[PDB]
Homo-oligomer: A and B are copies of this chain.
Amino acid sequence: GITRSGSELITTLKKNTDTEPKYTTAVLNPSEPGTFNQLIKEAAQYEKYRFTSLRFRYSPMSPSTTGGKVALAFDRDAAKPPPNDLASLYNIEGCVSSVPWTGFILTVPTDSTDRFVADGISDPKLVDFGKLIMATYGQGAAQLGEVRVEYTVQLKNRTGSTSAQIGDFAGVKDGPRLVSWSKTKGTAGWEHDCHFLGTGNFSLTLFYEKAPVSGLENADASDFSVLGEAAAGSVQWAGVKVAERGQGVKMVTTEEQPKGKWQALRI
């Protein structure tokens, strides 16, 4: 084995001037960028880990003239519906929400079993502890604060590999059959779907034939870079910068599914 130590800043939160919290539950595993954009680059050479240190601080950068709460407590079982309701939240360890005008920390009893990261899929339970959570309920106005993850990991067994990703459609069917980060659904009335399952800035590159409707548009997205035609048989490219998990981008070509091909590298 090798090791590490934290320094990440896992997404924020945003007002809530409402009477029911509202959660951003973020998942924890050596490779889940939506929780590690700087360490998901050294787990492409190993498989298994540790944790020995990891805590989340509500940095505190917003005056007191604002208030409410900012729940923040982890639940091993990093996967299952957040509740819907507080008490529900306020009953699951973690413990610790405080107001937004102060500086709090959060800590987690970490174990000691040689768990494996996801070069997929699996089951969200045998591969990673559990997701994190964060709610905040208030009404007085502000852009609360930010947090990270204080940690120290153990990456046993020397491996090495990974990426995102080339995924072609075959007139009858498709083809994602070589590491993901996006799911490509379509919404009928052809207008389509071009998605994510992972989080970070990417380098798209791809797909083609009948350069129709459009292409490479985007919606719940981060920066876009398209240097293509349209193509009616062309080539294309873009750089995303996402937001929280699952942000989407899309084309526009007819009616019913066959096309060409693509490849999505993470970067």
Contacts and interface: CB of A to CB of B under 8 A. Distances in A.
A38 to B, nearest CB: 5
A90 B142 contact: no
A60 B98 contact: yes
A184 to B, nearest CB: 16
Contacts of A141: 139-140
Copy total for this chain: 5
A91 B208 contact: no
A84 B223 contact: yes
State which size class the interface on A falls in: 35 or more
B61 A168 contact: no
A60 B69 contact: yes
Interface stretch (A107-115, A116-124, A230-238): A230-238
A126 interface: no
Interface-centre pick from A7, A100, A143 (highest chain B CB count, 10 A): A143
A145 interface: yes
A7 B89 CA distance: 9
Interface of A: 2, 7-12, 14-15, 18-19, 21, 37-38, 41-42, 45, 59-71, 84-93, 97-103, 136-143, 145-148, 158, 160-161, 163-166, 168, 178, 201, 203, 205-209, 222-223, 227-229, 231, 233-237, 239, 241, 243, 260-263, 265-267
8 A-B pairs with the lowest CB-CB distances in the bound complex, closest first = A63-B67, A61-B69, A9-B87, A208-B235, A63-B64, A235-B235, A9-B90, A265-B265
Given A60-B97, A234-B234, 9 more contacts: A7-B93, A8-B90, A62-B99, A63-B99, A65-B65, A139-B142, A161-B267, A203-B265, A263-B265
